[PDB]
């Protein structure tokens, strides 16, 4: 992984040593080159994972998450450089540095062989994320959002640290390959119940699990646009990636310990989907949409079937591109009208025709139109959950109806009807904005041609 | 007046000073280069060449090999009156049951 870690680190001197007026050009160009080389991680084998060294490895689960991560950095630089245009040079460079450091921690997080190396980098991502939210967020609420983000994550992750060290003392190793062969079944005792919760709650909070999600509508809404993109696209998926890994050592206890969290997710997805119908803040609506989608990933991971694991991997990738696109679309309106209220600016299809096409495509992927990879992931999860219990099709079916309703409600409210008379500063869409949207949707639809590369290790 | 604080600046329209702006930078030359690197490395390189690279991945995860291997075994086993597949994954003679 050093062929990706070292180039990522070099983005920092590149940013600091660049000419003042070339910081965005230079960092964007070279971050795209790194993203291009990440395609070499697609050398996956049917039986064995691609094991680089004692520290790092990549299998079909981490590889797509790595490619998404490295793809997101140039998109975030494009999304940020407009609203940071009046920031002074040194603070711009520090903003880019936080983004680079977050990428460094993420790519090492997804390839860490040892769960305690995974833990340190998994917590490490908090620091740059907190700084981005609180320093460069726009509203007073960013300070409160940072505290909710920080202490929800740590309340869960500190018990995880105790559990992981306990496992290493008992097994002798936290190396993930070793745990595949030395894993022992978990006896059903009270002490193992709390080991199970310690190993899972930190990941549940990051998903987020319904009930433990209050940090997300604060953090995702108060962050700057780059903060929201990475928060929704990648950082929510650390929880899914962590759960997909750690459930290996929790069988068979997951059979019954899953029930309370499956109920929270199956009912929670309907609750959060309903909330979207009455949200007044466009960014807040998009944030609650993420909670509903990640409820499917939680359920898929907990029922532990080959189909649910393929579906979960696809959804995580599909949601990452879609939710990031929606935040970027919402941000482009915000940079014009300087409000997040959804009813403020209406009929934007009349004033911004091409941008209204991006809204439509973003909405259709969000409601999982076939054959998008959003639908492929959702379908595979619904199939596996039907086998877990036929009755689940009712909750899955209702959620798909509600999801269509709020996805198109967002489209209709903002893009259709009559334009707001007094809003007269809706200038034409910039080339930058149009390129930013198409760099989300084009890869998303291309993956429909070759879905296997985002179906994970069970494929 | 309460504290001395600057009034909020008015929002600048990039198109006003540069009707050909791409939205990347206020400097027209830097603005054009930012567009070119994004479109070249973004679409020309990553999306086009990356799409081609993915399309020609050498038997991703052994699926084509497995099909050829399955054809070989099915041909052999049917040609010898053997079952196409057996319920036991492991030979029972290597297994010692309890009791």
């Amino acid at each position: 992984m050093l062929k990706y870690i070292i180039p990522t680190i070099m983005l920092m001197p590149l940013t600091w040593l660049s000419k003042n007026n070339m910081i965005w050009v230079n960092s964007t160009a070279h971050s795209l080159l790194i993203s291009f080389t990440s395609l070499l991680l697609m050398n996956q084998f049917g039986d064995n994972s691609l094991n680089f060294s004692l520290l790092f490895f990549s299998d079909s689960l981490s590889t797509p998450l790595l490619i998404l991560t490295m793809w997101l950095l140039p998109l975030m630089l494009m999304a940020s450089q407009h609203h940071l245009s009046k920031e002074n040079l040194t603070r711009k460079k520090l903003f880019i540095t936080m983004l680079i450091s977050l990428q460094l921690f993420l790519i090492m997080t997804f390839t860490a062989m040892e769960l305690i190396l995974f833990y340190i980098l998994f917590e490490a991502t908090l620091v740059p994320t907190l700084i981005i939210i609180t320093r460069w967020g726009n509203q007073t609420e960013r300070l409160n959002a940072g505290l909710y983000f920080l202490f929800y994550t740590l309340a869960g992750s500190l018990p995880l640290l105790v559990a992981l060290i306990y496992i290493q003392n008992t097994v002798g190793s936290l190396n993930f390959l070793m745990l595949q062969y030395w894993v022992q079944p978990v006896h059903n005792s009270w002490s193992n119940v709390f080991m199970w919760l310690a190993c899972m709650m930190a990941f549940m909070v990051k998903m987020p699990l319904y009930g433990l999600h209050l940090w997300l509508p604060k953090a995702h809404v108060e962050a700057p646009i780059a903060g929201s993109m990475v928060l929704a696209a990648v950082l929510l998926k650390l929880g899914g990636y962590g759960m997909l890994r750690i459930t290996l050592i929790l069988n068979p206890m997951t059979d019954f310990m899953a029930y309370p969290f499956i109920m929270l997710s199956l009912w929670g997805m309907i609750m959060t989907s309903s909330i979207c119908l009455r949200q007044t803040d466009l960014k807040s609506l998009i944030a609650y949409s993420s909670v509903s989608h990640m409820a499917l990933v939680i359920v898929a991971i907990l029922i532990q079937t080959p189909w649910s694991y393929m579906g979960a991997t696809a959804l995580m990738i599909a949601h990452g591109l879609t939710s990031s696109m929606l935040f970027c679309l919402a941000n482009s309106n915000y940079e014009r009208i300087h409000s997040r209220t959804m009813i403020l600016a209406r009929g934007l299809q009349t004033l911004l025709p091409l941008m209204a096409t991006w809204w439509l495509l973003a909405s259709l992927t969000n409601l999982a139109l076939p054959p998008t990879i959003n639908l492929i992931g959702e379908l595979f999860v619904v199939m596996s959950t039907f086998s877990w219990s036929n009755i689940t099709i009712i909750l899955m079916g209702v959620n798909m109806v509600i999801t269509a309703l709020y996805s198109l409600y967002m489209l209709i409210m903002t893009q259709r009807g009559k334009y707001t008379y007094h809003i007269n500063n809706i200038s034409p869409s910039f080339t930058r904005e149009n390129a930013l949207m198409s760099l989300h949707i084009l890869p998303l639809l291309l993956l429909t041609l070759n879905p296997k590369i985002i179906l994970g290790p069970l494929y | 007046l309460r504290w001395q604080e600057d009034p909020e600046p008015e929002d600048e329209n990039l198109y006003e000073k540069n009707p050909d702006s791409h939205g990347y930078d206020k400097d027209p030359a830097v603005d054009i280069w930012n567009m070119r690197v994004v479109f070249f490395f973004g679409f020309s390189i990553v999306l086009v060449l990356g799409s081609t690279f993915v399309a020609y991945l050498p038997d991703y995860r052994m699926q084509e090999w497995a099909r050829r291997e399955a054809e070989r075994l099915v041909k052999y086993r049917e040609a010898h009156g053997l079952p196409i597949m057996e319920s036991n994954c492991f030979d029972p003679s290597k297994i010692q049951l309890p009791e």
Binding site: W136, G137, N138 | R2, W3, E8
Partner: peptide, 19 residues
């Protein structure tokens, strides 16, 4: 709009004897 930064009302919360 411009990024919010603490005003005198916010700052005076931290100027008392106790929090």
């Amino acid at each position: 709009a411009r990024q919010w930064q603490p005003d005198v009302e916010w700052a005076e919360q931290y100027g008392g004897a106790v929090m």
